[PDB]
């Protein structure tokens, strides 16, 4: 088997081999980059997704949110607190202002250790769920606007024609802006793109050890699994690098930089932060490989992660035992 020992693997297509999407997805997989969970592309150097991103401005952040914690440093919960409207613009000059700008480090590991350190005691505000794309209608390869869907995969695979769509979506981020412990809706692909700024560190649960991440988390936040058979569904619970290592929790991390594609596999756990002012555009995607993740994917029931209407198709065709249930918890 190929990747036995899990690491996240990272590739330099030419621009040849950046021509069919699905072909190099499957590449990777044939070298086991889904086996880390997480993968890394750097695209051709003749590559580009837009001319520039001198005119970005004016897009409008309509609902910010400040990320505020509880716990303790390195086992903690974040609420989203809503917040006025404001455009990139505003929201740079937010993120570099004296309150929110990165500190002083000399290198990544350094901020790494700031940020586990420190991430608690400050409320940073995220641009999140943004639907859209910088990506030029005129970029051909890897445009993350331009992928085939998730309802025509499901349709070629299965033969079963659905209701949905399946759009990019865009994030602002500023220094210590968190994306807490999940793996994807119905436990899908995803695929980011980082545009523009400061890097975003990664941490990663190869997914043929997601319930040994999920044990701890049931253990270390007790009430919340109580109340909820799946509350990681619910993207609020953080765990330190340090707490995985102390509980034997096999992961990897990576720090991702301007211009660089990371993918999500199916059912791999992730989690990370931004290094400051940055702006990422992601999306989920699926390949034939993905239907029986599809099929097995834990589902939240409770109330707390209401989803995009296009999911419905996916829980109605692939769990029809759970469907009921969960349509309620949509409501
Ligand atoms: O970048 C973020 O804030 C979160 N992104 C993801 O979880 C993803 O691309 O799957
Ligand atoms: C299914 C289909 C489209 C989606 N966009 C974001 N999550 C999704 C799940
Ligand atoms: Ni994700
Ligand atoms: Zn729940």
């Known amino acids: 088997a ?21 072909k190099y997805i499957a590449y990777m997989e044939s070298q086991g980059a889904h086996r880390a969970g997480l993968a890394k592309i750097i695209p051709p150097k003749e590559w580009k997704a837009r001319e520039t991103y001198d005119n970005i401005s004016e897009i409008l952040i309509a609902t910010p949110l400040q990320q505020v914690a509880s716990g303790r440093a390195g086992v903690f919960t974040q609420y989203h607190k809503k917040k006025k409207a404001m455009t990139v613009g505003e929201y740079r000059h ?15 590991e350094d901020l790494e250790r700031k940020y586990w350190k420190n ?26 606007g331009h992928l085939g869907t998730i309802q025509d995969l499901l349709e070629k695979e ?6 949905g769509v399946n759009t990019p979506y865009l994030y602002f981020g500023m220094w210590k802006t968190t994306f807490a412990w999940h793996t994807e809706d119905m436990d899908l692909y995803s695929i980011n793109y980082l545009h523009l700024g400061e890097p975003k560190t990664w941490y990663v649960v190869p997914p043929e050890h997601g319930q040994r991440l999920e044990r701890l988390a049931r253990e270390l936040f007790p009430g919340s699994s109580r109340g909820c058979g799946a509350f990681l569904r619910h993207k609020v619970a953080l765990i330190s690098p340090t707490v995985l290592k102390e509980n034997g929790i096999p992961f990897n991390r990576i720090t991702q930089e301007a211009g660089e594609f990371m993918v999500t596999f199916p059912y791999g756990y ?3 932060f931004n290094h400051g002012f940055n702006c990422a555009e992601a999306i989920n995607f699926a390949t034939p490989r993905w239907i029986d ?9 409770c109330g707390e992660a209401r989803v995009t209407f ?11 035992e759970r469907y009921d249930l969960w349509k309620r918890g949509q409501d």
């Open 119 to 144: 991430r608690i005691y400050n409320s940073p505000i995220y641009g999140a769920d943004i639907s859209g794309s910088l990506f030029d209608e005129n970029t051909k390869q890897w445009n993350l």
């Open 158 to 163: 299965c033969g079963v024609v659905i209701e």
């Open 293 to 301: 993740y599809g099929k097995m994917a834990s589902q939240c029931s």
């Open 94 to 108: 937010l993120a570099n202002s004296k309150k929110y700008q990165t500190p002083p480090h000399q290198n990544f």
């Open 2 to 22: 190929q990747n036995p020992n899990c690491n996240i693997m990272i590739f330099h297509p030419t621009k040849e081999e950046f021509n069919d999407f699905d």
């Open 310 to 320: 296009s999911m419905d198709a996916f829980v109605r065709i692939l769990q029809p």
């Open 270 to 272: 992730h989690a990370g």
